[PDB]
Scaffold this motif. Structure first.
Motif, PDB file in Angstrom:
ATOM      1  N   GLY A   1      22.969  37.800  23.779  1.00 15.46           N
ATOM      2  CA  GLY A   1      24.393  37.918  24.105  1.00 15.46           C
ATOM      3  C   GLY A   1      24.878  36.691  24.852  1.00 15.46           C
ATOM      4  O   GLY A   1      24.065  36.043  25.538  1.00 15.46           O
ATOM      5  N   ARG A   2      26.163  36.395  24.698  1.00 14.24           N
ATOM      6  CA  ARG A   2      26.925  35.429  25.498  1.00 14.24           C
ATOM      7  C   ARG A   2      27.871  36.221  26.413  1.00 14.24           C
ATOM      8  O   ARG A   2      28.370  35.632  27.390  1.00 14.24           O
ATOM      9  CB  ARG A   2      27.629  34.474  24.532  1.00 14.24           C
ATOM     10  N   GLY A   3      28.068  37.518  26.145  1.00  9.29           N
ATOM     11  CA  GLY A   3      28.994  38.403  26.895  1.00  9.29           C
ATOM     12  C   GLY A   3      28.341  39.035  28.112  1.00  9.29           C
ATOM     13  O   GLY A   3      27.139  39.230  28.073  1.00  9.29           O
ATOM     14  N   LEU A   4      29.086  39.269  29.194  1.00 13.46           N
ATOM     15  CA  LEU A   4      28.528  39.883  30.428  1.00 13.46           C
ATOM     16  C   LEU A   4      29.286  41.170  30.748  1.00 13.46           C
ATOM     17  O   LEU A   4      30.529  41.098  30.962  1.00 13.46           O
ATOM     18  CB  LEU A   4      28.629  38.901  31.585  1.00 13.46           C
TER      19      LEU A   4
ATOM     20  N   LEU B   1      32.440  40.135  21.956  1.00 18.14           N
ATOM     21  CA  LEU B   1      32.539  40.455  23.399  1.00 18.14           C
ATOM     22  C   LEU B   1      33.062  39.203  24.112  1.00 18.14           C
ATOM     23  O   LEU B   1      33.830  39.361  25.089  1.00 18.14           O
ATOM     24  CB  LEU B   1      31.169  40.893  23.927  1.00 18.14           C
TER      25      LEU B   1
ATOM     26  N   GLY C   1      32.728  39.798  31.610  1.00 15.33           N
ATOM     27  CA  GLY C   1      32.678  38.335  31.666  1.00 15.33           C
ATOM     28  C   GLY C   1      32.133  37.756  30.388  1.00 15.33           C
ATOM     29  O   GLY C   1      31.832  38.498  29.425  1.00 15.33           O
ATOM     30  N   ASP C   2      32.002  36.449  30.391  1.00 14.59           N
ATOM     31  CA  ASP C   2      31.248  35.727  29.354  1.00 14.59           C
ATOM     32  C   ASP C   2      30.624  34.536  30.050  1.00 14.59           C
ATOM     33  O   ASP C   2      31.081  34.207  31.159  1.00 14.59           O
ATOM     34  CB  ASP C   2      32.144  35.356  28.177  1.00 14.59           C
TER      35      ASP C   2
ATOM     36  N   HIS D   1      27.766  41.020  20.550  1.00 17.71           N
ATOM     37  CA  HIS D   1      27.310  40.503  21.856  1.00 17.71           C
ATOM     38  C   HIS D   1      27.430  38.980  21.923  1.00 17.71           C
ATOM     39  O   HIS D   1      27.521  38.456  23.058  1.00 17.71           O
ATOM     40  CB  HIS D   1      25.892  40.991  22.117  1.00 17.71           C
TER      41      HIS D   1
ATOM     42  N   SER E   1      36.530  38.890  26.261  1.00 18.69           N
ATOM     43  CA  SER E   1      36.494  38.406  27.663  1.00 18.69           C
ATOM     44  C   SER E   1      37.537  37.294  27.832  1.00 18.69           C
ATOM     45  O   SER E   1      38.438  37.477  28.675  1.00 18.69           O
ATOM     46  CB  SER E   1      35.075  37.970  28.032  1.00 18.69           C
TER      47      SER E   1
END
Ligand SMILES: NC(=S)Nc1ccccc1
Ligand SMILES: NC(=S)Nc1ccccc1
Ligand SMILES: [Cu+2]
Ligand SMILES: [Cu+2]
Ligand SMILES: [Cu+2]
Ligand SMILES: [Cu+2]
Lengths: 450, 459
Positions: free
Chosen positions: A56-59, B301, A81-82, B297, B305
């Motif tokens: 993932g790059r997403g938080l 996502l 976040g990212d 992901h 964001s």
């Protein structure tokens, strides 16, 4: 400077993967500064839970009190976040006030690193302030903090006699194929050749699958289990532990996982400085991808009657040791600079040294007994299997006080190797045999990437 | 021959990924043959649920009545297998009797897979492992992945507008003109200026895909036309935005009832599984990727964001954001929620293509007919609001509201490159309701894999 024509699938590269691994888990949090307040929450004894997909790059995550992150209803604050161009020096995420009936962010958080410490800034977005926070990542608890081996079992396990025996037993058979005839004669002269004299069963030579070395592997561990179980109840894993449930699907199950509540949670991979090959290897066998690609595949094969029924006990033992067995050790290994195999400095003998990556310490680990039991139970599926496809052709027999199998079409030999006791303080003999043999940790020595 | 020295991460290759995809989901199952019975279970009215991880070689699942597979208490039977050496000819698994308090397998299952020409067929023989010659067989039909229109219903009035030739041809031509502008000859361009179908202002056209696409205000036309289409659509039916992008399916291991539900597409927002395009492995890999949970992901996502981060948005003119969002997220939202439809050519105007059935998310001639189209365009539209707020925060007053062509919009400024958004001939036509035959003509000038697949790159 022209913009992109299209999107591509943009999976985290090394730096994003490792930064995600630094973030992932449960953080104790306090607010600091005269303006530092979140509505309806104390300033201290807060927790921050963060998740990032393996690539993932997403938080994502949540910010509430500990009892509320564990609760059924939505936490007060959600993290979005990212990690694009984010690193140790800038980590940004927004908060969402889930009690406000809007997903519009109420706060802009930025954090820095100085098991890891974030120093951070929050800005109220309703404002156009001295608002900071400190977050200390919680301990990933070690199996020993959760499964207590009793004074009797532990005394035996940590003894020099047993530590050196377990090491040498592995080392003799592991190295035999590579040892000179001078080395081999030295070991023979002190009773530590791997199996019958002038017919030894090297575990790692070209003939490892057919020489019956596999039977030594199964037997010695069955013998070790039998002894350990006389002093304490050590049930087998019935099923291999599943990887952690992602935060998006079971927030409380995700959080409990990091408390290692049963000692069976996978300890996070560590970065080995100046060894990226080791670092990737470890990361992969501790991953969810590895469970589904390798670990589940072993779980199915080694309980498949048709799969086991094609194998002698020798073939089965060799396959399982060479594949699943080194991977079970490093997947459940928590962190040690690795002890050199012939270093007998007193500190290495202390109960703290329970490193799964080295047969000198591996057996002191509580989790060792759970998967050796699972391994030993697979021997019963293999017997049920031959009893199905080849009735009568495998016979039970007791060997060294241990329930076992008589030689046959599917049992290459009947003299299984336990060291000098079957095929021959003086803890000193075993030091001398280790030194003759030796002239990344032990279970990392055969590492291969794909 | 020599046995391996070590294990290595053995991720599924293409054939094993594709097999797992054919297996994954909920199957209707019957037992058949003289000796065909499972303890506590009827012979008919059974279900078989399988899962395989995206690059997983292992096979898990459950076999009980439909009510039981959705129930909290453990299913009576559990599937464990692996796909090593497996193909359409041989899939094997063991069954575990969860009432037995043993995990030792009670049954050996051997299966053959047939494509249909339900959604695939699994069939073969079961052996009781208690027994030291039985007629024990089963048939499993995979359940159809329900389409969005079988779940979200666009009402008679709205449907009529969307399926009309006027509207389908508008939508295709509006994109085609601006998407192709930068490739068109001067002769093709004068012809389109000729019927008032040039993208935006005459001799100062805002091509959507030329080298100055991010800075030529094309972005504003993208945002404005969809906002215009949304206001009209929403006048006829309550079409609420997505607040948040749907998550990938919860693995079977962690939430068995949630996994099973997902495959009923009960809210119309489940990701239709990927199809294999024949002779087009590049396209098959691409589509598989952006339907994957990895894509969620890795990209979706991240967009979720970035486009709600004040600081990210405040760096961008309304038209920089337009170009950026259209060219990345927009084309990817289409194909991720795209279900299966040969794809219709741009220039083919056969009546059958106009039927309401034709709601393919991959083609602006049909995309607007899909219900899910209105969920993600509402979401895109709503981020224009985050973008305004963002400028009110970093650049107070430097962006001002203003009603335009009837729509709550934004007055030209430092951060709004133009005040004349392109709806088509109505707003910018300077030739020599809209005429259907003029639109057919414009599309023929422009056209001398589905539409939203045309700019695919792999990593
Ligand atoms: N956290 C770790 S062990 N790092 C790592 C190294 C290489 C590849 C992927 C991850
Ligand atoms: N089911 C599909 S679209 N196939 C596929 C093709 C390439 C790589 C992975 C999967
Ligand atoms: Cu071991
Ligand atoms: Cu050992
Ligand atoms: Cu669109
Ligand atoms: Cu459109």
């Amino acid at each position: 400077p022209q913009t992109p024509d299209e999107a591509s699938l943009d999976l985290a590269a090394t730096d994003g993967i490792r930064l995600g691994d630094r973030l992932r888990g449960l953080w104790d949090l306090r607010l600091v500064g005269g303006d530092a307040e979140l509505p309806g929450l104390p300033r201290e004894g807060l927790q921050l839970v963060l998740d990032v997909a393996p690539k993932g790059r997403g938080l994502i995550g949540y910010l509430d009190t500990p009892e509320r992150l564990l609760a059924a209803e939505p936490p007060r604050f959600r993290v979005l976040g990212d990690l694009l161009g984010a690193s140790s020096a800038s980590i940004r995420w927004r908060l969402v006030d889930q009690a406000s009936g809007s997903v519009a962010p109420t706060h802009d958080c930025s954090a820095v690193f100085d098991d890891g410490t974030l120093s951070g800034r929050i800005q109220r977005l309703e404002r156009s302030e001295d608002f900071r926070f400190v977050a200390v990542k919680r301990h990933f608890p070690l199996a020993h903090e959760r499964i207590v081996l009793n004074e009797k079992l532990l005394g035996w396990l940590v003894s020099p006699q047993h530590r050196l025996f377990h090491q040498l037993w592995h080392a003799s058979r592991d190295k035999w194929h590579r040892l000179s005839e001078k080395q081999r004669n030295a070991l023979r002269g002190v009773g530590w050749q791997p199996g019958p004299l002038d017919r030894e069963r090297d575990a790692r030579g070209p003939r490892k699958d057919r020489n019956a070395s596999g039977i030594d592997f199964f037997f010695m561990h069955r013998h070790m289990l039998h002894t350990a179980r006389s002093m304490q109840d050590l049930p087998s894993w019935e099923r291999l532990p599943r990887p952690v449930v992602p935060l998006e699907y079971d927030r409380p199950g995700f959080i409990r996982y990091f408390d290692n509540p049963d000692g069976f949670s996978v300890p996070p991979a560590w970065v080995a400085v100046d060894d990226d090959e080791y670092s990737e290897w470890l990361h992969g066998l501790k991953s969810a991808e590895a469970y589904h690609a390798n670990f589940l595949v072993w779980e199915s094969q080694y309980q498949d009657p048709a799969y086991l029924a094609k194998l002698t006990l020798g073939q089965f033992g060799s396959e399982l040791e060479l594949g699943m067995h080194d991977w079970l050790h490093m997947r459940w290994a928590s962190v040690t600079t690795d002890r050199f195999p012939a270093d007998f400095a007193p500190r290495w003998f202390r109960p703290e040294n329970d490193f799964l990556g080295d047969p000198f310490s591996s057996h002191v680990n509580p989790v060792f007994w759970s998967f050796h039991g699972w391994i030993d139970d697979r021997i019963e599926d293999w017997y049920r299997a031959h009893e199905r496809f080849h009735p009568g052709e495998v016979q039970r027999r007791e060997v060294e006080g241990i329930q076992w199998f008589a030689p046959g079409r599917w049992v290459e030999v009947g003299d299984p190797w336990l060291g000098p006791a079957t095929h021959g303080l003086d803890v000193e003999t075993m030091k001398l045999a280790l030194r003759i043999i030796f002239s990344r940790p032990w279970y990392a020595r055969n590492l291969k990437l794909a």
